[PDB]
């Protein structure tokens, strides 16, 4: 029955190409190896949109366990799953949906900038572990739940020249964007998640209290951000038309921000900021030269990152 099931799913996909968009490249999508950093609400909905698109290789990276309030919001878990590790449970759930899925779960902890390193070697192994996973996949979806957690993955993906689709949620809004990648032939690079402010990511969790901020969101933002993130990926994977920023699947916006209170969606674009604590060339050069020796310093000393990127230079400038 697996065979007939496989054919039935494949035919559904083939029909959109054969009868609707003959120029559609389904193969590129099918063979895309996807790395999902975060198996929470976004990770679960993104993975579901991805399998519907024919993607066969998805790897979840999450070190948490299914909590009691998770199931109603994280679409791959059930009540009976509570207490079990998320990453592996998520991969197993995708296979229950479609057995031919090459779904894997890795219970990996992403070293967070601004947090004290507790076990040098142990977190050095995490770093290399993360870089390797990023290197072996084609598209990296950054679906974590803190500003800090998005830093290391952003840098490593840029370093490994991988396309990154970053999705983040607010109570009533969401952001979906593709980070720019550096190109020698072109002097036009798109911004990343960190190009929009002037402070180095740092610890925003340890000191956090309900007073600082609540984490609850309207259910709808996760489903919307997830579907748009995947649709952005499938379009971006298509060959764009000669004289435009469009493909057979439509536009390939750099950044998308949506809001539920007024049911709106804005398409935006921003260039890579030279003093970005994540993609600044100075930060890239630092990594290329010292690798982990540089990262370990930025991780414990976010203010150092600002010195390296040049954010201190522009603040000191206004300081005078």
């Amino acid at each position: 029955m697996l065979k007939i099931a496989d054919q039935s799913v494949d035919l559904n996909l083939k029909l959109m190409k054969w009868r609707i968009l003959p120029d559609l490249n389904l193969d590129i999508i099918k063979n895309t190896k996807v790395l999902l950093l975060g198996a929470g609400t976004l990770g679960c909905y993104v993975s579901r949109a991805l399998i519907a698109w024919g993607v066969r290789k998805i790897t979840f990276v999450d070190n948490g366990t299914v909590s009691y309030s998770n199931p109603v919001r994280q679409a791959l878990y059930n009540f009976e799953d509570c207490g079990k590790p998320k990453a592996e449970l998520a991969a197993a759930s995708l296979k229950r949906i479609f057995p031919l899925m090459d779904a894997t779960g890795v219970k990996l902890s992403i070293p967070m900038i601004g947090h004290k390193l507790v076990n040098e070697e142990a977190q050095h192994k995490d770093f290399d572990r993360l870089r390797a996973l990023i290197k072996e996949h084609d598209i990296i979806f950054l679906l974590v739940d803190s500003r800090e957690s998005r830093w290391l993955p952003s840098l490593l993906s840029n370093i490994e020249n991988k396309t990154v689709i970053n999705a983040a949620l607010g109570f009533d809004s969401y952001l979906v964007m593709r980070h720019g990648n550096r190109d020698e032939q072109s002097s036009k690079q798109l911004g990343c998640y960190f190009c929009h402010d002037v402070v180095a990511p740092t610890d925003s969790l340890t000191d956090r209290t309900l007073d600082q901020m609540c984490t609850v969101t309207r259910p709808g933002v996760a489903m919307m951000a997830s579907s748009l993130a995947v649709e952005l990926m499938t379009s971006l994977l298509q060959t764009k038309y000669s004289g435009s920023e469009t493909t057979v699947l439509g536009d390939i916006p750099h950044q998308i921000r949506g809001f539920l209170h007024n049911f709106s969606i804005l398409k935006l674009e921003t260039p890579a900021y030279e003093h970005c604590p994540a993609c600044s060339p100075k930060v890239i050069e630092a990594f290329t030269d010292l690798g982990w020796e540089f990262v370990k310093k930025a991780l414990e000393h976010p203010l150092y990152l600002e010195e390296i990127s040049g954010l201190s230079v522009i603040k000191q400038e206004v300081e005078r």
């Binding site: 109570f171 969401y174 921003t270 603040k315």
Partner: protein
């Protein structure tokens, strides 16, 4: 809102009275997004220097507003995110309101997953 408490004439006036007086400053009205969940202060009017970059202007906002460094924000200028490396003068020339002022909005950046 600033516009919600001042007519075009009175607003188009202070704008010119500000340009004629300080041809080096930029009349900016910065207030927090409507549904955003972050700090704000009564100071909505700002006269920043044209050579100051968007990033530099952002520093003032979060500083003056007393926002912690652990939380990020982003600013809107006519439903658009301006380049961080752009000169406030350049931004003022492309998004200034007919009333003479450059209206800016800021909100907390999204971080949940």
């Amino acid at each position: 809102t600033f516009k919600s408490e001042y007519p075009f004439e009175k607003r188009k006036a202070e704008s010119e009275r500000i340009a004629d007086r300080f041809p080096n400053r930029i009349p900016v009205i910065c207030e927090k997004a409507e549904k955003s969940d972050i700090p704000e202060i009564d100071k909505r009017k700002y006269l920043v220097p044209a050579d100051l970059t968007v990033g530099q202007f952002v520093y003032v906002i979060r500083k003056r507003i007393m926002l912690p460094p652990e939380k990020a924000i982003f600013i809107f200028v006519n439903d658009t995110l301006p380049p961080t490396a752009a000169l406030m003068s350049a931004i003022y020339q492309e998004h200034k309101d007919k009333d003479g002022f450059l209206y800016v909005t800021y909100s907390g950046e999204n971080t949940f997953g």
